[PDB]
Structure formats: C-alpha cells, structure tokens
Design a protein around this nucleic acid. Structure first.
Ligand SMILES: CC[C@H]1OC(=O)[C@@](C)(F)C(=O)[C@H](C)[C@@H](O[C@@H]2O[C@H](C)C[C@H](N(C)C)[C@H]2O)[C@](C)(OC)C[C@@H](C)C(=O)[C@H](C)[C@H]2N(CCCCn3cc(-c4cccc(N)c4)nn3)C(=O)O[C@]12C
Ligand SMILES: [K+]
Ligand SMILES: [K+]
Ligand SMILES: [Mg+2]
Ligand SMILES: [Mg+2]
Ligand SMILES: [Mg+2]
Ligand SMILES: [Mg+2]
Ligand SMILES: [Mg+2]
Ligand SMILES: [Mg+2]
Ligand SMILES: [Mg+2]
Ligand SMILES: [Mg+2]
Ligand SMILES: [Mg+2]
Ligand SMILES: [Mg+2]
Ligand SMILES: [Mg+2]
Ligand SMILES: [Mg+2]
Ligand SMILES: [Mg+2]
Ligand SMILES: [Mg+2]
Ligand SMILES: [Mg+2]
Ligand SMILES: [Mg+2]
Ligand SMILES: [Mg+2]
Ligand SMILES: [Mg+2]
Ligand SMILES: [Mg+2]
Ligand SMILES: [Mg+2]
Ligand SMILES: [Mg+2]
Ligand SMILES: [Mg+2]
Ligand SMILES: [Mg+2]
Ligand SMILES: [Mg+2]
Ligand SMILES: [Mg+2]
Ligand SMILES: [Mg+2]
Ligand SMILES: [Mg+2]
Ligand SMILES: [Mg+2]
Ligand SMILES: [Mg+2]
Ligand SMILES: [Zn+2]
Lengths: 42, 215, 122, 118, 111
RNA sequence: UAAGGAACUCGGCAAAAUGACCCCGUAACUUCGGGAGAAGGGGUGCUCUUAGAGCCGCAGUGAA
RNA sequence: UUGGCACCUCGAUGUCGGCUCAUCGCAUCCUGGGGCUGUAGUCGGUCCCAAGGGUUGGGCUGUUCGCCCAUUAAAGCGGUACGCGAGCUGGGUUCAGAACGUCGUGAGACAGUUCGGUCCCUAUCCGUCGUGGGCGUAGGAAAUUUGAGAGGAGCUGUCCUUAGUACGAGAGGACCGGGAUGGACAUACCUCUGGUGUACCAGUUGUCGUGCCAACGGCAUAGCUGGGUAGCUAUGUGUGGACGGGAUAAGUGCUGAAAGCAUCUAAGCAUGAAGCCCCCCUCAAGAUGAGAUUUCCCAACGUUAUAAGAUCCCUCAAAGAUGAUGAGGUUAAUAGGUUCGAGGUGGAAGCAUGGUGACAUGUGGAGCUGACGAAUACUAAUCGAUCGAAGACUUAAU
C-alpha cells in the first residue's frame, strides 16, 4: 500500500528510461515547402 | 511414417457406415513440397523440411510477408519450388523415401490412419484465474467480497514468498497443442482435402501439422 | 440430468408417487445421472395401499428426462418430465406396471422387464 | 462495428445525426472512428436513394433526420438524398464517401478528419 | 454459401428424396431401428435449423400423456421415409410455445 | 441462462416470485371488533350487433 | 496435545471456524510389490517396500471435533504464525444496549445463558503470473532447427471371457491372462445439443412526434414479448493417462567360500514395484558454454551514402491492455462500399380482392438482414522518411 523506502534518484531515473515521446511521422509537402504528418492533408 | 501440412478450414459432419454421426475437421493440404533433407552427417539428425502454401515471388520494395524475400527465394529455388508460406520439419518420417522438390500429396494418408494433429490453439488475451486456470469463484452473496480473485497465493512467514508455478492471471491460449490418436475419415485428392475425425487446435485458416501417431 | 435433491415422478404402480434423489451411484464424485442410471432416492409422496411407502429409501432407474439423450446417429430424444422406476437389486421393477413412454436405452441397460411392461419404447 | 463510447441508443442517434449532417453539408469534420462508422451508414443511405422506390424511401426515412434545407428553394434531407445525390451517383458502384485525416485536436488530441461525398 | 471446400466434401452426404416441409407440419418419420424394423414417429415439426449436412429438425408428439420430442439430422440415412400428413398454419419458425400447452390449446390449424 | 431447485449459507443474505381493477370464495382461534387482501380461484385485447357474434397474437392491467 | 519457562514482539506480531489457493512429511487410507499366517477357496490378520497419482455429497452444531444419512478403490495422519483476513466471510470469541439464573447490602459480577451489535489501505522493494525494449552471442540478415535444462502428465471402478475351471462335503468361488465399458481429472474445439448474442428479424402496450390517413421515429430495463448469425461458450463434441525399455526397493534366488558341511554374498550371476531414469506433451542457446543447417547481401572518404534485411506511417484480424504477433499497403482484395450468397426471421410496402368492421387472402417462402462465404479497385491503404555490415588477434592444418 505505501512505499517502504524512498526511491533513490538512480532508481527513479532508471524507471524513467522509457518515459519519453517520439518525433512524429512527418513528410515534406511538395508545393508549400513545409512538413506535415504522413497520410494527413494540410 | 507420414506427415503433411495444411490449413484448418472448418468443422462439419459425415455419416459413417451404419449411419453414425462423425464430427470432422476439414484440412486443405495442397501445395506441400519437400524443400530440404536434413541428415545426421550434415545436420546431426534426420528430418525432411516441408514447405506449404506457395507465396508470391520476390519483388523490389515488397512491404509484407506475401512476397518472398531473397533468402527465402534462394532456399526455395534450391529445391526448384515456389517460395512457401509455412515451413516445418518432420523427423518421424524416413528421409530415404523423399527427394528434394517432390510433392507431398494428400494421398499420402489413407482413411483409417491414426494421426496426431499439432497446431497453435486459439488466442484469448489476458484472462483471470477462473477462466485461465479453471478455479472456483468465491460466494456471490452472503456478504462476500471475493468473486473471481485467485485466492491465497502462499503461506505465512514460512515461506515469506510465492512459489514458482503459482497460477495467476495472464495471457491465455496461443500455445502449441498436439491432439493425439485422431483418425483420418476421408481423403479427397481433388480439392486436396483430408477429413480428420473430431476437432483440432486453432482458428479457421490456422496452420496444422498432421503426423502418423506416435503411439 | 438428475442430481442430489432432484425430485422425480415415479412411472410405476409400486405406491411411490414422487421421490427425491439422495445419491447418484457409479463412482466417487459423480454429480449427475441420466436415463438408465440408478439412483438412491427417498419417497416424498405416496399413494394409499402401495407396497412402497413414504419415507422409504429405495433404488430407482431413470426412465425419462427433460434433458433427454443423444444417440450415436446424431439423433436426440427428450421428454416433458423426469420419471423413474423403483427397482430391486435384480433390476426388476418393484411395481407391476409402467406408465408413459420410456427410452430405448433401458434395453442396453438390461432393464428388460421394464422395457417389456412399458406402453411405448422410443 | 464500433461502440464510440456511447450506449446503443446514443450511438444510433449520433450516427443518424452525423449521416444527415453529411447529406446536408456534403463535407464535415469529425473524429476518425466516427467517420469510419458514418461512411457505412451514409453509403447505405445513398444505396437506398439510388434504388429510389417508395419502400426504399421509407427505409431511408427510418434513419435520416428531419432537417430542412434552404435559390430560395426548400427541400428535406430525404428529398435531397433521393434527388440530387442519387442522380449524381447513378453510375458509381459504391465508394460514395472519402475520409481525409488532418491531425490531432488541441483540446483532447483527437484525430480530426474530414469525411466528404465524392 | 458456406466454405466451398466444406460444401464440396459434404455434397455426397445430402439426400434428394426428402419432401419439402415447414414448421407446423405433421410428419410421419419412418426410422430404421435395429432384426431391422421401421418405427414410425408421427408428430408436428416444431423446429428446423442449420444448413447443409448439419441441418436438423425436431418433431413433437404426445405419447401416453407425456410430451416426447425427437431431433433428427435432415440427411441421416437412418430415416427411411418422411411423409407430410398435414400442413399446419403457424406464424413463426420455432414453435417452442407448444411445449407448455396441452389438449386443444396445443391444436394447430390446417391450411 | 440448459438440467436441477436452498444441494448455498450461521441464516434463503441477495435475487426471483406476489402485485392493479372486477367477480367468486375464505380456516383454527377470538377480547365477537377481528383473524382477512386469510387461503384459494376465475375475467380483462380489438371489432360489430344490442348480453350475443366475430377477429388477432406466444402472450390482452401485452409498457411502467 | 494439555502444560512448564518468560527469550523476540505491548510507539500493536488481528484471535476460532469456514471460503479461495495450495505446498511439504510419511508413522500409507486406496491403488502397485512382498514375507509370515492359527493362509483350503472367496475373504481376512500382521509385518516389510512404496509418497506416483488419488483420497465425497449431505442432516445437526459458529463450531474444530463428533454422531448420523447415502456413497466410494479409498473417504489416511500430520507440518506450513493450530498455512492462507494489505485474498474473502464474520456465525463464535476481549466492546458500549437489554434480559434470565446465580452471587453481591450495593455499584456491579459470572466453571453461565440469551437477543442485537462499523472488517480501513490507490502495491515502493523482494516474490509470483504475463508481456515488451536494450545490448550480447567477432560481418550483417531471413527462415528452419539440436536440446543442456525445466515444467506437465502419472488415479481408478464395473462387466464379459479364461471358468462355475483351481480349491472346497457343501455353501461358495479364484490367481495368472485376454477383452469391453465407465467415474473423476486434464486438454482442444463449436459440426451437433443448448446458453448468450444492447447496430439481426418479427409481434405488442402507453405516450410524444414526423401536418392528416397509411407508413415510420423517440422514450418507457434493449419498454415488453417470440426467435436468432458470427464470436465467446458447457451442461455439448473429440482426445489423453492401465504401453514398453533400463536400473532398483522390500523380496526371491543361482553359483559359492570364509566355516570340509550349510549358507542369496564375501567375490561373481539373475530376477523383482502404481515408485527412479526414459518413453508421452510443452517451454527452452541470456545453455554469456550464447550451439547447428539452408539461403541472401558485399564501399568509399569516425563521416556520407548504403546492401540483404527491417521499421516509421497507413488498411487491418485468425492476434491483442499497450507493446508484441499475424494478414495487407496500388506490381494491391487489407478494410469499407457495391453485387451475389449461406444463415436468421417468417410472409415488407404499395396495390387489388373479400368483410359492416376488427381483419383475411393474393401479388410473393415476400421483405429485411452485425459479425459468415465469394466476386468487384467504387473509397481509403499517397509521396515519403529512418535504421541497417564492410567482417580483430594467436596458434596448428593434411
Ligand atoms: C473505515 C475507516 C476507519 O477504519 C476502520 O475503522 C478500520 C476498519 F480500519 C479499523 O477498525 C482499523 C483496522 C483499526 O485498527 C485496529 O485497531 C485494533 C485495536 C488493533 C488492530 N491491529 C493492530 C491488531 C488494528 O488494525 C482502527 C483502530 O480503526 C478503528 C485504526 C485506527 C488508525 C483508526 O481509528 C482509523 C483512523 C479509522 N477511523 C476511526 C473509525 C471509528 C469508527 N468509525 C467511524 C466511522 C465514520 C466516520 C465518519 C463518517 C462515516 N460514514 C463513518 N466509521 N467507523 C477512521 O476514521 O478511519 C479509519 C481508517
Ligand atoms: K455451438
Ligand atoms: K544464439
Ligand atoms: Mg463453489
Ligand atoms: Mg459483489
Ligand atoms: Mg469502439
Ligand atoms: Mg431506450
Ligand atoms: Mg432455417
Ligand atoms: Mg437456470
Ligand atoms: Mg429452464
Ligand atoms: Mg420447483
Ligand atoms: Mg443445507
Ligand atoms: Mg454446506
Ligand atoms: Mg431478502
Ligand atoms: Mg399492475
Ligand atoms: Mg507450547
Ligand atoms: Mg529469568
Ligand atoms: Mg504485544
Ligand atoms: Mg513499530
Ligand atoms: Mg515407510
Ligand atoms: Mg432443512
Ligand atoms: Mg492459522
Ligand atoms: Mg495475510
Ligand atoms: Mg451492559
Ligand atoms: Mg439479592
Ligand atoms: Mg438478527
Ligand atoms: Mg532434457
Ligand atoms: Mg456455427
Ligand atoms: Mg448455437
Ligand atoms: Mg396512423
Ligand atoms: Mg422526447
Ligand atoms: Mg421524458
Ligand atoms: Zn502542404
């Protein structure tokens, strides 16, 4: 129910190893010279 | 002995001699080809490799398993066969009676033959102890707050841990399963079909392996 | 599909009218019995003057069930009620008459006297 | 079929509303899952319009909402469906709608799409 | 259809001498029982279900005051013949409501 | 929700069942008021004629 | 077990029974093997080996226990905080109310009894059940694999025949074998029997709508009712464990001396259990000891671009919490639509005819139809982007 010991900085950062986001899937739009999400329309 | 690969089509029934109802599974075992012969001298054991269900030839920029990649294409061409969707090894058979590139026809088996059928059972996803392990529910009334929980998972200070092998919730199904001592009811050379008495593992279209029964 | 506490009509003239199932015989942990199986039962309701009396603990063979039975040819037979016949150790009926239809599986069970006395065997 | 986070009656009402809105406007913006269900609903309505008989009209009226459309003329959604839209799709064998993704909404990250008549 | 392979492999089992009938009809079913004799089960068709070789039908009768129901696969060779004695008038495919009725309340009008 | 029907459980807990209106009918006991809505049974739809004749459904206080 | 002691815990180590889930011991309840018998046979008594599996459903009581009813091959005895309340219950037992008996002058009390009486907690670590990512496995990659090792399974009844034979005055009634069929358990699966089936079909009540008739829609548990496809399912349909090989236990010996003989033992040689190791099923090379086979790929100046091969993204389902897996991505049937079907429902609307009317009949097995089968690019799976090796050293080699 409750933490028996406090979490060390090391353990917390190890846990957060995978807690991140990814760059979105994007492709260049030919006419406007900008970027958009793949399979999406401007 | 004997072996073949096929797809499970579905269940139906037939009427045997004296009219008894025989439930059966239809297996379509077309396009079986011996791709390789493994031997003790080279591989350390005797086996025949059988490919099943020809797939499309290699093409550039293929995006799915429908098209053979170059390693698979070379492996099949070495047998002078089209690339195959499913590849499995048979150790029960006698390798001296097969040639690389030869067809394995449904006519390999005969009605009355006793077989073992192997396949991947149907998946069920994340399931609890009641369904996955067939445990009892707690009471559904009389003040109960215990219905589908798994129950006690151990003992007290001894042993102060849960033993390996404790039955708990988790993914269910999708396991390799062998059903033993089924019978071949009918072999139909056209349509390349084998009728297996009873039922076999897996969903419809799932791959099944038919072998002569070990026992 | 007969289990402990199932109440059954009696399809004979032995005196018992309704019985209550005490035990399904034929092995440890057996839960249910069907046509041709033998049960230990108690007579809950009896008619006057019969040989079998209320409160007696007797043995009976199941002769028809609502669940019915499946035959090897893929056919089924089902009845509108659960009825049994009080028997002796020799599998002969205790009564001298049988009422209503009984299943042909009794013949395979070797309850030939009951089959003979039945007005219809289906 | 999808449940769209609603009970059966709520989902049916929302699908009728969306289909009628698409018939009225010819192009709407919604969520991806909603549009993936609305496409089937709308295409079956258009099939009924292409049939064009009285029974098909009454079956379509089972689903369409009662929304007036205002050259100062006035017609109901059912009239538009059995007139203009059916006539425009007389020669096309299915595929009367198309979905175009646009990216997440700010408020809840929902995948916004535009579904339009082709 | 069903799967083409299933239909092809079970085509030979189908019988081509069974009369057409519907629920509510009275049938005489001549069942082979074995010393091979024929026992006639006469009663009303209360249900037909399934398709192909798996199709079944159920016939109900009152035997000595006790309702009896017999379910047969449509194409079982164990049936010698089927005779349609009466053509009943009903409003639904499954006549399960007949189970709870007795006497004239269970009567089915003829066409 | 098959078949069973309290075998559950400390205990029928919970749930199921009953339920409206109209007409029949109603026990021991009683302080003669009661008990009593005892219990247990029948009828309800629609159309037409002026209580009959019809019509339809598995089902008519067809829901609550 | 009842105790003795008072060593951990009173800034808290929740007490009985039951439920759920087990796990271990063997002083073994059943089943397997064997010696003796005051073992004729069928049955028994006793002792030895043996822990593989199995070992119940009720009446009473809070009960544990115990008695009883009916079974069973058997209904074994113990340990695990009298296993298990951050898994459940809360009948009993240390609570406030009340009453009886009893004791007390009394307030109150009990080798007693009786009715009633709040069971909190979002899991950090270890542990356990599942499921992904990283790196390693001296090139990179696709597929097929060996099996070190680990897990699973392991039960048993009845009947027929041998044979009414052996044994036995008789009654009764075999071993050894050979056949058949069940109980419980496990596992797969939906053809069948049934269950469910809230975007399938139909009937029906009240009320509000769509202007009205007709036909429909909303709400009333999916309003209710009768059916029901796929899928998921057991009570339904199949299958499995009584086989065999090796080594053994208690036993039984053969040959055989010490001990001239005797002696199963001391050296030798056999035989002998449901038990051990295999045989059967499943997982398994992070087996860092990182294995094997087949096939594919081949550059230059850490950098850039890449090969075989993967992914991102998108259409999805046999897969699924998410990842992952598998089917597909235009050189395309992956999903939606469309068209034709299977199955389900059971006779649409409109019109006509008959009826005073409720309705009926005909057009017409009609109309409708989620998930199931097939055909068809009509709609959407666009363009594109990212990752991805260049094969070290030492020693021997016919
Ligand atoms: C339901 C919630 C209560 O939990 C409980 O009552 C139980 C079920 F969790 C409980 O009884 C625990 C288990 C108790 O602890 C035990 O104490 C024993 C002596 C020993 C045992 N161990 C150590 C062997 C301990 O575990 C105790 C003392 O709570 C009374 C814990 C202490 C810390 C305690 O007092 C706590 C603070 C107690 N409490 C007083 C309630 C006091 C009674 N109460 C009040 C209310 C309430 C108030 C307002 C509104 C509403 N609707 C209800 N509900 N119940 C609360 O307000 O909250 C809780 C947590
Ligand atoms: K089924
Ligand atoms: K490896
Ligand atoms: Mg239980
Ligand atoms: Mg609950
Ligand atoms: Mg959804
Ligand atoms: Mg509603
Ligand atoms: Mg049908
Ligand atoms: Mg039930
Ligand atoms: Mg029922
Ligand atoms: Mg009852
Ligand atoms: Mg009880
Ligand atoms: Mg109990
Ligand atoms: Mg209650
Ligand atoms: Mg009412
Ligand atoms: Mg002590
Ligand atoms: Mg001291
Ligand atoms: Mg303390
Ligand atoms: Mg402390
Ligand atoms: Mg011992
Ligand atoms: Mg009682
Ligand atoms: Mg304890
Ligand atoms: Mg605990
Ligand atoms: Mg007090
Ligand atoms: Mg006193
Ligand atoms: Mg109380
Ligand atoms: Mg191993
Ligand atoms: Mg089906
Ligand atoms: Mg079904
Ligand atoms: Mg109207
Ligand atoms: Mg409203
Ligand atoms: Mg309202
Ligand atoms: Zn742009």
């Amino acid at each position: 129910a409750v933490p028996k010991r406090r979490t060390s900085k090391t353990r917390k950062n190890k846990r957060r190893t995978h807690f991140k986001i990814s760059v979105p899937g994007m492709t260049e739009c030919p006419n406007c010279g900008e970027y958009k999400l793949s399979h999406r329309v401007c | 002995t004997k072996g073949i690969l096929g797809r499970k089509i579905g269940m139906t029934q037939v009427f045997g001699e004296n009219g008894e109802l025989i439930p059966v599974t239809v297996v379509e075992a077309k396009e079986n080809v011996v791709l390789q012969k493994k031997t003790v001298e080279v591989d350390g054991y005797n086996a025949i490799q059988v490919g099943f269900e020809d797939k499309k030839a290699y093409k550039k920029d293929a995006k799915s398993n429908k098209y053979a990649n170059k390693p698979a294409e070379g492996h099949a061409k070495k047998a002078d066969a089209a690339p195959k969707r499913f590849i499995r090894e048979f150790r029960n058979v006698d390798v001296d009676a097969y040639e690389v590139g030869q067809e394995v026809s449904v006519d390999t088996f005969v009605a009355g033959d006793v077989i073992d059928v192997t396949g991947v059972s149907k998946g069920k996803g994340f399931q609890g102890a009641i369904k996955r392990h067939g445990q009892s529910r707690g009471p559904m009334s009389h003040g109960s707050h215990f219905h589908r929980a798994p129950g006690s998972v151990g003992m007290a200070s001894d042993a102060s841990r849960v033993f390996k092998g404790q039955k708990m919730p988790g993914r269910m199904g999708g396991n390799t399963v062998t059903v033993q001592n089924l019978e071949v009811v009918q072999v139909d050379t056209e349509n390349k079909v084998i009728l297996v008495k009873g039922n076999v593992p897996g969903p419809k279209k799932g791959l099944v392996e038919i072998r002569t029964s070990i026992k | 599909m007969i289990q402990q506490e199932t109440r059954l009509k009696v399809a004979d003239n032995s005196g018992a009218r309704e019985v209550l199932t005490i035990k399904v015989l034929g092995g440890s942990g057996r839960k249910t019995a069907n046509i041709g199986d033998v049960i230990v039962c108690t007579v809950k309701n009896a008619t006057p003057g019969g040989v079998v009396k209320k409160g007696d603990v007797v043995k009976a063979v199941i002769v028809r069930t609502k669940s019915g039975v499946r035959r090897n040819d893929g056919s089924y037979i089902k009845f509108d009620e659960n009825a049994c016949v009080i028997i002796r150790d020799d599998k002969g009926p205790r009564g001298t008459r049988i009422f209503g239809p009984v299943a042909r599986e009794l013949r395979e069970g070797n309850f030939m006297k009951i089959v003979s006395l039945a007005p219809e065997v289906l | 079929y999808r449940k769209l986070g609603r009970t059966s009656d709520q989902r049916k009402a929302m699908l009728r509303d969306l289909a009628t809105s698409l018939i009225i406007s010819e192009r709407i913006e919604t969520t991806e899952a909603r549009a993936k269900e609305v496409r089937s609903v709308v295409e079956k309505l258009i099939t009924l319009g292409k049939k064009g008989d009285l029974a098909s009209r009454r079956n379509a009226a089972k689903t369409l909402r009662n929304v007036e459309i205002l050259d100062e003329t006035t017609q109901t959604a059912l009239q538009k469906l059995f007139g203009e839209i059916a006539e425009r799709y007389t020669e096309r064998q299915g595929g009367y709608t198309r979905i175009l993704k646009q990216g997440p909404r700010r408020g809840d990250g929902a995948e916004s799409v535009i579904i339009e008549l082709v | 259809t069903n799967h083409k392979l299933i239909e092809a492999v079970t085509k030979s089992q189908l019988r081509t001498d069974l009369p057409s009938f519907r629920p509510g009809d009275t049938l005489r079913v001549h069942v082979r029982i074995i010393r091979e004799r024929i026992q006639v089960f006469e009663g009303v068709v209360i249900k037909r279900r399934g398709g192909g070789v798996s199709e079944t039908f159920t016939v109900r009768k009152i035997s000595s005051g006790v309702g009896v129901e017999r379910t047969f696969p449509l194409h079982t060779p164990k049936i010698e013949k089927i005779e349609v004695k009466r053509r009943g008038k009903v409003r639904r495919a499954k006549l399960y409501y007949l189970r709870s009725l007795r006497g004239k309340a269970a009567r089915i009008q003829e066409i």
